[model samples]
Target: EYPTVSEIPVGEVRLYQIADGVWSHIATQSFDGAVYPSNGLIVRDGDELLLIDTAWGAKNTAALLAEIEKQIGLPVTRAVSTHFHDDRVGGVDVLRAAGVATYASPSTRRLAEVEGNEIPTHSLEGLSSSGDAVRFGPVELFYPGAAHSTDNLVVYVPSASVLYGGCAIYELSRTSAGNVADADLAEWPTSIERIQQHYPEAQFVIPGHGLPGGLDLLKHTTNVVKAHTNR
Candidate 1:
């Protein structure tokens, strides 16, 4: 299914939920062209806006920008890539062309510099350096690391306790096995634990793929990983 946006206009800026957060956006040649879809999110902080993970290709990323204009009536000031992956950062060039500043972990930039072209256009977050918090009003880019990939990041929206886990936690389905090729497997569960630690009362969880969920999704992901590893 294609991506769409929903908005809630409250303060100086508006909030948009881009994409349904379902399916993997990654394509694996090793897995016979298996495709995994990732989720993308956008938030407005007054006149400035912050975007989270540009999915798939230019078309998909461009569509997200268009959706934002329709809902927020402003261009994005900053963009953050949740990690280093095709499905997560496929539209970096698109954002750069528009002069939007992209923020990413140091590790993510290194991956892009070496394999820029093959790094999936949006997969690289463009900035030479980044910080712990990507300010967007009530939202912040809490930390960088874990679950899905080494550079995975979790975006936190304080007001609603909405923790956006991009491919970090597999939500509530077995759509595809967790991508552990670039993941820190040994550190995986601990990563989820850390996320849970920060937002103990997270009322909602917006994963990279699949539907938005609650705490139960965390438990489900834990069970899924444990079962897979045990075998």
Candidate 2:
């Protein structure tokens, strides 16, 4: 059992075990009295930690780090953003300040630079095309094309057969595409199909916003997108 580490009241950031050596940092952000939740994953790699995305901002990122250290007894060694959005890459500056090596797709970096958000320390080059996979320790970052955002990528942990879908995919509770300010609605279905084709063995699928579930969530997302498009 992994066990609970810490849940910060101010930031509403909670750390919970998803699987053996895998945890989720569910961070909440508030805007004008509305609350939004973002999900980030942490994988214990040997004696170190690998973070997939960070909290919604610097303060929450610091809280996340404290919880991680308290639970695992080690600091986050490296991190990779799944997209350029604030919910995914918002803590880039905080992680960098704490001496953590952070990375993201070149396209994501470019978008972040354009939007004036915190930029990751490094770019995952050669991911200009879909189906490209970049290995970072035990997990694999795969680009399946534009969906939720142009630079969105998914994390595949082969050992646990888990897929961190980020904002590229949706949860069961999400009936419509959450945000489309930078989304490619026309390419959304195909992008999800690519993910389905790539990670056929993924048993646990985690979305950036809601509850984690099985492969059916992908199918659900596709159907939701289709319905939205048809309407």
By TM-score, the best candidate is 2
Q: lDDT per prediction?
A: 0.60, 0.85
Clashing pairs in 2: none
Off by over 4 Å in 1: 1-36, 115-137, 175-178
Give Cα distance to truth, residue 48, candidate 1, Å: 2.2
TM-score, model 2 to reference? 0.93
lDDT of 1 by residue, 174-225 (tens): 5445556776666677777777776788877877765668867777777777
lDDT of 2 by residue, 1-231 (tens): 212223334475778787788888888777666676778899878888999998889889988888787877777889999999888888888899889999988899999999988899887887889889888886999999999898999999888888999887778878976547798889989999999999999999988877788889899988888887787
What's the TM-score of every candidate structure? 0.75, 0.93
The C-alpha stretches of model 2 lying farther than 4 A from their native spots are: 1-10
**Model 1 residue 8 distance off true place after TM-score fit, in angstroms:** 22
TM-score of decoy 1: 0.75
